[PDB]
Amino acid sequence: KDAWEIPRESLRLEVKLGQGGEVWMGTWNGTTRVAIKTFLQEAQVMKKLRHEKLVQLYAVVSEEPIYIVMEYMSKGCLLDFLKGEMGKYLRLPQLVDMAAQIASGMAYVERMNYVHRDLRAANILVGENLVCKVADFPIKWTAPEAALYGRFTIKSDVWSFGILLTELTTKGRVPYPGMVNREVLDQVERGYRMPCPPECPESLHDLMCQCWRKDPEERPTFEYLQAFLEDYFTSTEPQYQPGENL
Ligand SMILES: */C=C/C(=O)Nc1cccc(-c2c(-c3ccc(N4CCN(C)CC4)cc3)[nH]c3ncn(CC)c(=O)c23)c1
Numbered sequence: 001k002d003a004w005e006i007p008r009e010s011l012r013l014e015v016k017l018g019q020g021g022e023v024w025m026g027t028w029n030g031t032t033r034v035a036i037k038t039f040l041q042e043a044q045v046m047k048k049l050r051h052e053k054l055v056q057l058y059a060v061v062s063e064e065p066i067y068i069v070m071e072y073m074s075k076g077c078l079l080d081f082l083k084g085e086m087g088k089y090l091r092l093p094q095l096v097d098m099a100a101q102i103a104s105g106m107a108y109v110e111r112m113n114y115v116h117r118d119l120r121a122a123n124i125l126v127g128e129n130l131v132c133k134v135a136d137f138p139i140k141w142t143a144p145e146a147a148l149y150g151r152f153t154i155k156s157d158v159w160s161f162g163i164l165l166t167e168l169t170t171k172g173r174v175p176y177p178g179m180v181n182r183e184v185l186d187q188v189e190r191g192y193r194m195p196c197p198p199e200c201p202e203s204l205h206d207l208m209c210q211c212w213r214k215d216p217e218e219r220p221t222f223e224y225l226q227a228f229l230e231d232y233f234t235s236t237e238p239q240y241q242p243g244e245n246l
Contacts, residue, residue, distance in 0.1 A: 004047060006059040011036060011067065028069060034058055037068040045137045046070075049112060053105030055125055055135040073125035073133060081126045082172035092246045095168040096204075096232050098132045103226035105134040106161065110154050110222045117152050119160040121167040139181045140174070144189055145216060155216035161225065162211025169197040169204065169246065199246040203236050 006028075013024040013036060021038040028034040046057035061067040075081055078098070082090070102124055109116060116123075116137060123136035143159035145151040163175050176184045176194060193212050196205040207228065213219050220228075233240055 004060045033072045035070045035072040051108040055133045073127045075126035078124035079121040087171035100229035101132040107222035107226045116157050155219050158219040162208045169200045199243040
């Protein structure tokens with residue numbers, strides 16, 4: 001139907017990665033390794049977004065079975081990355097850089113006037129050299145005005161980014177530990193915010209709390225978050241010292 005179309009025979013499905021449809025690792029033509037998701041709204045959104053920190057759409061097959069060919073991220077989702085063997089070795093410099101890449105991708109989304117709506121570690125993908133990219137275009141990750149009234153905006157994504165900062169600094173732990181969804185909603189609406197993770201510097205938790213401001217228009221932009229995180233160990237914590245875990 002459009003210029004993202006390709007012949008199905010040009011794809012070779014090699015390994016199954018996940019289920020829900022399914023996602024496969026394969027080869028496009030004979031030269032390019034790709035991820036193949038086996039619905040159109042996701043592709044239509046990606047067709048307009050091209051950024052180094054967003055999993056890139058490659059091609060689409062519109063005749064059933066429907067395929068969505070995408071960039072292959074070799075290390076899986078960030079959640080599983082943090083929770084696996086790597087987590088014990090990651091320290092604050094690596095986690096802040098990873099968060100910086102995520103904000104760079106979201107800063108692009110922001111400039112394009114799009115909204116993600118489900119930002120969290122399980123929807124970031126990891127590649128080689130600690131490359132992180134936003135993918136997959138959850139009350140504990142959702143801003144109150146979006147969870148209660150369906151007001152999803154780039155500012156609800158910033159709220160989500162704040163929660164995702166707790167995932168990074170706890171290396172994959174679930175937010176609001178020990179609390180069920182209904183208790184989080186009741187407590188957050190009454191003003192509760194998660195405290196400073198252990199070994200997390202106050203300056204990073206202040207950034208979290210800014211993402212968690214009641215008024216969505218007072219939450220920082222992703223442009224701001226990206227610059228703050230890129231500059232973090234010169235402008236904000238130039239005397240950082242490694243701890244027991246961060
Ligand atoms: C948070 C879990 C998650 O998102 N899993 C997941 C489901 C479906 C597809 C992908 C995926 C992967 C991917 C890469 C590498 C791995 N590994 C399996 C376990 N060994 C130990 C390490 C490597 C699993 C999954 N790569 C992908 N590339 C692109 N996409 C489309 C956006 C993927 O979905 C994807 C992960």
